[PDB]
Design a binder for this molecule. Structure first.
Ligand SMILES: O=S([O-])[O-]
Ligand SMILES: [Cl-]
Length: 416
């Protein structure tokens, strides 16, 4: 019997995964056993399995974990599976980069599903503020002009009878800090880390990265983000948006499904926000348009005693039918680019816009030491948000924080 470890990807995560593999089980005449790891403990459990040799056949891995676990020497090469699924041209480039440790020419993980983020907006609020959505979400200048108009607007939510916040975004020292910043960094022409001068180094303190960071964080100093937003997580901001408190916020495609679910079943179909829902990609910066991608991949431990059957299950879970099916349950975009043509996506205007957003997808570099980089970036970005909460983020203060971040990161990148 094969054993798979997964994270809570869908509302009934084990059940959905079992329904997903039921045809594979029938064709191979096996049961696949599943264990669900909470996102909190998943990494600890997976590293304990890597060090001990005691674990599942397959594990889910977040895309940013691939480099670290690969570098431990515990993953089976899966170039054969990826060739079977269509090779490099079967994936968005940003997704293909998540199949390996950066600069390896051997794949160790199979793309499973993508998490990308775009802006949701209140179509009624923008109509009432006189804001063209295409031009608000096309450029930085359009975006900040749109928030200005939304702040000035006399519009009130029909249900709350109160104004809407122009923009809600969190400012907590969580991993979401870095992916909410990344499109602004990238659109300015910056990066979190880059190769330069023969080494990997932080680029958080580059003029371009600082430009992007300051543009975004300064919106919360201009009155466009309510103070209360800064200490909420993405779940709480999503609930504020559903409750008619927010004109604009960034998230993945899951909320699209929930706008069709009645409040009696855990959704928000009856709320004004569900009936007046738009999506747009992140605006272009001066140096280009980028959409953050994350999500999850699958990997096979090389200590598995069922590698041949495990490889057949990776091809199954990576392939068209299972990619389309699982997306109905996760609300996430398939990792397999072919699957985006399915009518389940193309006949839903809001999902078609996420697929437009996908063309601009970009991932973090697949470094073995990525988690140490991310922790240091998150902590220092959280200090910049904390200055925002005081109305004291200046460009020089932001630069000094990112200078400290860059020294810490540069030191982390020198050890292995
Ligand atoms: O604040 S830490 O970079 O020393
Ligand atoms: Cl980067």
């Amino acid at each position: 019997t094969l054993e798979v470890w997964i994270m809570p990807n869908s509302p009934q995560p084990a059940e959905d995964f079992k329904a997903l593999v039921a045809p594979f089980e029938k064709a191979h005449g096996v049961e696949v056993k599943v264990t669900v790891l909470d996102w909190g403990v998943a990494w600890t459990k997976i590293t304990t399995a890597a060090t001990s040799g005691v674990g599942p056949d397959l594990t889910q891995l977040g895309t940013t974990w691939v480099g670290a676990i690969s570098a431990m020497g515990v993953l089976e090469p899966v170039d054969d599976v990826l060739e079977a699924l269509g090779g490099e041209k079967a994936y968005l480039p940003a997704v293909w980069r998540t199949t390996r440790l950066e600069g390896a020419r051997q794949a160790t993980a199979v793309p499973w599903f993508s998490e990308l983020r775009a802006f949701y907006y209140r179509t009624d609020a923008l109509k009432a503020a006189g804001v063209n959505p295409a031009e608000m979400f096309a450029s930085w200048q359009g975006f900040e002009a749109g928030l200005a108009r939304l702040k000035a607007s006399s519009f009130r939510d029909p249900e709350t009878k109160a104004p809407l916040a122009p923009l809600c975004t969190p400012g907590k020292n969580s991993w979401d800090v870095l992916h909410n910043a990344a499109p602004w960094i990238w659109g300015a022409g910056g990066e979190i880390v880059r190769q330069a001068g023969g080494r990997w180094q932080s680029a958080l303190n580059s003029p371009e990265s600082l430009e992007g960071l300051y543009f975004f964080l300064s919106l919360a100093q201009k009155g466009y983000v309510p103070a209360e937003s800064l200490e909420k997580n993405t779940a709480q901001i999503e609930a504020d948006f559903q409750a008619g408190k927010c004109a604009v916020f960034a998230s993945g495609p899951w909320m699209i499904q929930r706008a069709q679910v009645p409040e009696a079943k855990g959704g928000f179909a009856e709320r004004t926000a569900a009936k007046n829902l738009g999506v747009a990609p992140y605006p272009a910066g001066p140096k280009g348009r980028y959409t953050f991608f994350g999500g999850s991949n699958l990997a096979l431990f090389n200590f598995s005693k069922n590698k041949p059957l495990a490889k057949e299950l990776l091809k199954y879970l990576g392939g068209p039918e299972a990619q389309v099916r699982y997306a109905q349950m996760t609300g996430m975009l398939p990792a397999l680019r072919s699957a985006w043509s399915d009518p389940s996506f193309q006949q839903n205007p809001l999902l078609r816009t996420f697929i437009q957003a996908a063309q601009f997808g970009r991932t973090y570099p697949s470094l073995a030491g990525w988690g140490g980089v991310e922790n240091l970036a998150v902590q220092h970005l959280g200090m910049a948000w904390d200055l925002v909460a005081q109305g004291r983020l200046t460009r020089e203060a932001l630069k000094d924080l990112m200078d400290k971040a860059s020294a810490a990161i540069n030191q982390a990148l020198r050890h292995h």
